[PDB]
Enzyme design. Structure first.
Site, mmCIF file in Angstrom:
data_model
loop_
_atom_site.group_PDB
_atom_site.id
_atom_site.type_symbol
_atom_site.label_atom_id
_atom_site.label_comp_id
_atom_site.label_asym_id
_atom_site.label_seq_id
_atom_site.Cartn_x
_atom_site.Cartn_y
_atom_site.Cartn_z
ATOM 1 N N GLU A 66 0.968 -1.189 0.021
ATOM 2 C CA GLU A 66 -0.103 0.008 -0.027
ATOM 3 C C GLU A 66 0.894 1.139 -0.176
ATOM 4 O OE1 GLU A 66 -1.380 2.132 2.930
ATOM 5 O OE2 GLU A 66 -0.487 0.838 4.528
ATOM 6 N N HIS A 295 -25.667 1.651 30.714
ATOM 7 C CA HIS A 295 -26.805 3.009 31.231
ATOM 8 C C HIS A 295 -26.439 3.344 32.204
ATOM 9 C CE1 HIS A 295 -30.932 4.010 29.760
ATOM 10 N NE2 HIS A 295 -30.967 4.475 31.338
#
Lengths: 935, 932
Positions: A66, A295
């Protein structure tokens, strides 16, 4: 390869940009996005080939490839015009590799895509792989490895690869290193360049590549240009199955590891593998389970651990590796008491899971999350021209182009069996314990080979996993109740027939002052209301200031649990301590805004204080005062000068002497006394009818009298502090010594009359004129200290210029350098040409004339004007016209008669932190400047 | 008394005239008095007030010059005041003269005896003047009650005879009867004035012998007729009025209960002075005292009881009782309570120790008589000279060396239900009174209390709940003076400096008085923070003073004194008097204030009184309102009566109780030591007060930032400011114009004060004497918040703009006058100002108070006056012109001018600067720096 599937795809109703997604015959995934309004244009290509690769001959070879595609071989570096072209269009590109895929994003200022498209097309069409090119890239790959070695985030990620099965290729080192890149293959006899040839020919050709264009050009124009240069690339029809099965064989399950990172931090990770369940993404059950774990409402898992203090913060989320295998991760904050009770914390998490099993899957909570997701999707925010391309390109490989926008923002189906399956996955059998602490160092004899991270990987003898399974019992935790406020009104109220460009006093009463505005230049239901409450007793005594802070700190802390649901709704509550008044900030959708506002008002009017909460808050406040003793000199000098300016102020040492007698009963008695008399100032904003807004103000005042018995303040009970008058003829200096910082800090300040529209412009212009030269020489060429400050000061309705410098030099020498700078500036302004002076004022004028970018920002400008009591909402528009009128001669005169060393009106004061023997005596001698008249 | 000088020489003439010779060298003014035993009771029955008419006639009697006022003009030349009055059985004359002119003044008085003209023109003017004096007396509410009392006892008895006299009785009725009033004056003067009982007291300084030789020869000029003294064998009342209640209408709104008991002439015996001793018992406030029982009921705030004046054969005893609405309803019970106290006195009986303690206090106090006013001393001596030699009267009257327990028993026996004569004075008697005294128009009625109630008074003879007063300390611990310290400072210095305490110490040396003064100031920031906070502070102070008053009375009897004041900065405590109980008294006062219990009923009545004061200011003189409005601006933050009234309603007893510990939690104390106290002992007293405070309230020193004073708003230069307020109650309009100059400085203080003195003498003649616009005229400088300003306050029913224009015209005239005045005249003006500033205090209290004012101002230069007066002498006429030009001048550039306009109820400026909102103006103007 000419093909174009045609569909009309719905998008956020607010969003205007039009996009068409099509598939070519070669099979490259193509997305065309057209946004003519945005000046910037962009494109992105993602190949779904990760750092992990099927051949294990060398490590980092895929990462090198890459990099080899962005090197431009030898031709692109040889052309300096190619790099110049990117610089001319202000285009910056980032190239990176991830295990799932390698991603690159680039941008062009306007219509520079054609040239860029050809440059990107060349790498795929034909990569030269030249010898001269390879030499530069191998050094760059070695440099990339260097930064990864010290990256703690990467060190945790590589440790996860190590915990992967050794036989499995998942345990390969993705980054690679120079020795692996070139030294290891040459002795092996492997050729790196030959491998790069084979990989580019087949893997890149296979249909794992997606192309997206954000070009402003029309979709038809986008189609012709993109299709012609991507038609040449063909398909080798190579199928990639990634990893079929999870690497873990249960050998590394139920093991506890101790990790010592270079940084000092404490995190706990429990590792459980999970199935892919990708096709049923409608429910998204694993994230829903994570939300219940994370939560913070009634009967929350964190709420119990908070009382123990073992876990300060708990976060639960899905973790995704290969498509074939995924994991679930729970992160808990570690405290010294928590480290002793590590096993108990693990049992408590199981107790919450036991409660989840007893309740079972619930349709209503999933429905509420779906409604919240739909609201968030409809009002899309923070759209980005750059980096948006990379995200969609990765999504395109796993998701259909038509559904990419709504795939993560909408829930369409319920999957109770999937919720049971993830619950089944969370069992102590699949649990793996990883603990991070500095104290663990010296107890670990095993070191990771790749990076210097020490993990014992010791196999817990006498495993306690059996005890946790045997002792499981129903948890005391209770599932959270339905959210009180959910926005249902998305319609925007019609603009009032009367139009006001600035806030208007619709209602004026002795009890309250009411400013009202309607939304303009913005079309959102969102409306924001800021209210100020002022009471005299808060600043009356040092004890009163300390007690008021403790009450306000306790107030917000108690309300924090009750307002977690409001944070999910997007409503914003802020309670902060200000010496003069208490600031309440309410932001969010207008329809559900009043319910939250009233509940806060009732809590503020009548507050109950727990003794244990008061003790911990008092200890934290005491520790903060101790911290200021070892605090940096430049901030300490800024505080010392600020203390002198106010008519009466409490010394920090005195504040922490008088905390000795503070008690809970005195604080409880204080709350009714302070509440009994106060004045309310209102800054309502957003789209609402004036009559409804007047009613909202009336209910708030009615509740305050009903509970707190608040009555209107008498005249003269609302007086602002008056700054001490400078001698105007002398410079005064006092000396104090710091104990922890080797740099000596001196602060020099010049008072400048009283606030006026012309006076504000003169101070701002002078600061702008001297800022660039001070940066040029005092900040860099002299480099006396890193901290050099030449900025305007506005406080107590007065303007001043402040020079905060921290340097390892005598304070008197630093003052001499500031004096040398002032004389240099005198000569510099005269030397500067009139045309350059006009360019200076024009730059300041553009900075002053900034149109609001957000609804909240527009309201903030009005909020500042009212709290100062100027009430001059349009002052900036009047001032900018004056700034053009302002001339160079007037600015030279302003400094020569006021800020000059020989100036008759010379306001100079000096504060030294390494004589004013008594601060009070000097302040008593000086007169007091009057409050500025309100406009 | 050792402090008194001489006064021990006296001679009695063969005629029987009583002469006392006084020779005080220290006294700078000579004096002389005459007396004679003749009175209104001894006037011819038909004639009314003949003796009072005759006392005026004696002065114009001299035939030396044909001028009636020739003696008066002679007295004016020597600047000696001459006043004469006639008592019931005595006629008294007194006058004073220059130190070396005593013989000349006596010769002029001697001319009156040789020839008493009593001229016809003088008589015609005198009858009107005596009638005018009687007319002025009618308005006096107290005088009208006194005249009714004399008449009621018996019309036949001479007690009913008029004392003041009136023109119709003196001249119109005798002249119609053909009697010549002038002939009557001559015959009366020979028969009574010249005949006998004359008493002359002479004060001289040149020599005791020089006055003695002249007086004996000159006062023998009259030939004595050996006329005897009038005596009354029995009290005028025939017992017809006894046991008879009266209701009397008073001109003023006063409610009093009066009971008269006829008693024998114990005072004539002078053996024990028993009636006054009994009066002290009833008057004393202590546990189980009559006043304490009355205060608990709330029926009577206070009562006073002293032996009433009596004739040669009889005396009277009366009680004065304050009446409250509830007390008026229970008046009969209040009289029953007085009887219950008398029964308790009978049970205790006469006690030698109570008399001995009072006698010991009187004897030591008689030795310690601080000062005697030379004028009028001769007149008081002349009255007692006839009945007692000065040595005998001074010793007997002051300490009562002889003791009779039987006489005390007799006077207690004399008080009885049968002896009581009852009268009630109340404003609720209007329209219920028919009988009207002819001379004073007083209205009174007979409402005999039902015989059965009189029988109830007789059958009820039981003591209630009364406790005999505890013995207190009435004797100074050391009569002698503690020796002055070897190291001494003329002006008090900072002997002790503490975070919580400040100490200044001086021991009075020249005065050589055992008495000493200690001053303490307590500082609390919260007192001025809110209108509610200022209001509750006054209520706490009023509750504290009422609660500790009973203990304080004992100190007052010893002559020790305490003061509690609600200053905005904090509580003020001052202790003055002998050091015998001064340390003990100080500790008790601290104990009561720091730890206090609040009575709800007392709090409610105190709250109502404070609320009544706030509404009262609406009805106030217009000029007083102008001072109040100016005071608000000068003190910066301050609160109007209106907002205070709403805050006063807000205060509650639980809130007040919570605030007292918070107020006392942190305090700063500054103290001044003066008088005969050792420095080491004074340091111990300072340690004691702080130690008491820390135990009671855990007092902590204020932080320097916490301790701050008020600041004053600064007016712009060349600025004129005015605002209009309307007083509904007063028809006239008052204007106050305040001209600020500069922060107080030694040079600045001298210049403005010189200007105020320079214009003070012209202002009275130019404005009040000539313009006569209004009665209220003021031209004096005002000091507040360390700033000097001049204030002109005029109240008149004339246009305010016209009055202010007259004030501006007066200033322009004064500038012209300053140029007109000669340099020598200006020097004379500064000389008068220098003498006024350089005044030595004649009392220990005055000098300490002068030191105290500087300490509260935060200026510690005690000897500021000597430096200031030297600067005042150096002043020049040109310098005052410059001071007028810089600020006082109308067009002055640095001038700061503020005008307060109080408009009349039914009622221009060259420059108008109306102030709409005071709060906006306070924010607009800067604050003057606090003095260093």
């Amino acid at each position: 390869a000419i093909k174009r599937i045609g569909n009309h795809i719905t998008k956020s109703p607010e969003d205007k940009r039009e996009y068409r997604g099509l598939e070519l015959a070669n099979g490259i995934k193509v997305l065309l996005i057209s946004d003519p309004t945005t000046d910037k244009s962009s494109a992105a290509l993602d190949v779904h080939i990760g750092s992990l690769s099927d051949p294990p001959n060398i490590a980092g070879l895929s990462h090198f490839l890459e990099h080899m595609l962005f090197l431009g071989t030898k031709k692109y570096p040889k052309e300096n015009e190619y790099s110049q072209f990117l610089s001319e269009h202000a285009g910056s590109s980032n190239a990176f590799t991830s295990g799932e895929h390698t991603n690159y994003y680039f941008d062009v200022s306007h219509e520079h895509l054609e040239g860029a498209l050809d440059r990107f097309a060349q790498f795929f069409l034909s990569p030269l792989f030249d010898e001269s090119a390879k030499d530069r890239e191998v050094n760059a790959v070695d440099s990339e490895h260097e930064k990864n070695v010290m990256n703690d985030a990467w060190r945790l990620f590589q440790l996860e690869k190590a915990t992967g099965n050794p036989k499995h290729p998942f345990s390969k080192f993705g980054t690679g290193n120079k020795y692996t890149l070139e030294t290891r293959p040459n002795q092996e006899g492997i050729d790196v360049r030959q491998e790069l040839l084979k990989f580019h020919s087949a893997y890149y050709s296979s249909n794992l590549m997606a192309v997206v264009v954000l070009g402003r050009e029309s979709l038809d124009d986008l189609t012709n240009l993109v299709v012609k240069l991507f038609s040449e690339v063909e398909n080798k029809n190579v199928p990639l199955p990634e990893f079929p099965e999870h690497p873990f064989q249960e050998e590394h399950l139920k093991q506890l590891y101790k990790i010592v990172p270079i940084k000092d931090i404490r995190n706990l990770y429990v590792t459980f593998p999970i199935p892919d369940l990708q096709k049923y993404y409608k429910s998204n059950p694993g994230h829903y389970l994570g939300h219940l774990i994370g939560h913070e409402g009634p009967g929350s898992l964190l709420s119990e651990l908070k009382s123990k203090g073992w876990v300060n913060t708990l976060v639960g989320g899905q973790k995704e590796g290969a498509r074939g295998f995924m994991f679930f991760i729970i992160n808990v904050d570690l405290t010294e008491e928590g480290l002793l009770h590590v096993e108990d914390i693990i049992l408590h998490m199981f107790q919450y899971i036991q409660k989840l099993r007893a309740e079972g899957p619930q349709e209503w909570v999933f429905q509420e999350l779906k409604d919240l997701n739909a609201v968030a999707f409809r009002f899309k925010d923070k759209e980005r021209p750059r980096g948006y391309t990379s995200k969609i390109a990765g999504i395109l490989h796993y998701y259909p182009l038509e559904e990419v926008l709504t795939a993560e923002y909408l829930l369409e189906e319920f999957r109770p069996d999937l919720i049971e399956m993830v619950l089944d996955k969370l069992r102590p059998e699949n649990v793996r314990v990883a603990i991070v602490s500095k104290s663990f160092e010296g107890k670990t004899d095993r070191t990771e080979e790749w990076y210097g991270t020490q993990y014992k990987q010791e196999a817990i003898p006498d495993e306690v996993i059996k005890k946790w399974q045997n002792a499981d019992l129903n948890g005391k935790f209770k599932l959270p109740t339905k959210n009180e406020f959910i926005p249902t009104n998305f319609e925007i109220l019609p603009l009032e027939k009367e139009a006001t460009p600035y806030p208007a006093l619709i209602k004026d009463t002795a009890m309250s002052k009411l400013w009202f505005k309607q939304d303009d230049k913005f079309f959102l239901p969102k409306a924001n209301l800021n209210f100020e409450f002022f009471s005299p007793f808060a600043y009356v005594d040092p004890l009163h200031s300390n007690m008021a802070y403790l009450y306000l700190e306790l107030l917000k802390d108690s309300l924090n649990e009750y307002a977690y649901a409001a944070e999910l709704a997007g409503l914003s509550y802020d309670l902060q301590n200000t010496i003069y008044g208490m600031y309440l900030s309410v932001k969010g959708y207008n329809d559900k805004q009043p319910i939250l506002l009233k509940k806060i008002i009732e809590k503020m009017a009548t507050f109950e204080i727990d003794e244990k909460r008061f003790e911990i808050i008092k200890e934290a406040y005491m520790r903060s005062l101790n911290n200021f003793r070892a605090e940096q000199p430049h901030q300490h000098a800024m505080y010392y000068l600020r203390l002198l300016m106010t008519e009466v102020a409490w010394t920090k040492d005195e504040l922490k002497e008088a905390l000795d007698d503070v008690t809970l009963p005195r604080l409880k008695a204080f709350i009714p006394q302070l509440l009994s008399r106060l004045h309310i100032e209102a800054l309502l904003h957003g789209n609402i009818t004036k009559q409804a807004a007047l009613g909202i103000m009336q209910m708030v005042e009615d509740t305050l009298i009903e509970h707190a018995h608040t009555k209107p303040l008498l005249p003269s009970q609302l007086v602002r502090y008056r700054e001490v008058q400078l001698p105007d003829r002398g410079w005064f200096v006092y000396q104090q010594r710091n104990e922890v910082h080797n740099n000596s800090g001196i602060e020099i300040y010049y008072q400048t009359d009283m606030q006026s529209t012309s006076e504000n412009m003169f101070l701002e212009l002078f600061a702008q004129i001297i800022s660039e030269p001070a940066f040029n020489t005092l900040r860099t060429k002299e480099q006396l200290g890193y901290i050099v400050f030449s900025g305007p000061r506005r406080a107590n309705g007065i303007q001043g210029l402040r020079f905060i410098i921290q340097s390892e030099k005598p304070p008197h020498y630093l003052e001499s350098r500031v004096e040398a700078f002032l004389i240099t500036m005198e000569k510099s302004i005269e030397d500067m040409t009139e045309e350059a002076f006009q360019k200076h004022i024009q730059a300041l004028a553009i900075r002053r004339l900034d149109k609001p970018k957000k609804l909240s920002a527009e309201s903030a400008k009005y909020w500042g004007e009212i709290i100062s009591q100027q009430y001059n909402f349009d002052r900036d528009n009047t001032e900018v016209a004056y700034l053009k009128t302002l001339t160079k001669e007037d600015i030279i005169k302003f400094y020569k008669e006021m800020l000059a060393v020989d100036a008759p009106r010379r306001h100079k004061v000096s504060v030294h932190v390494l004589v004013i023997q008594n601060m009070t005596e000097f302040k008593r001698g000086l007169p007091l400047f009057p409050l500025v008249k309100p406009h």
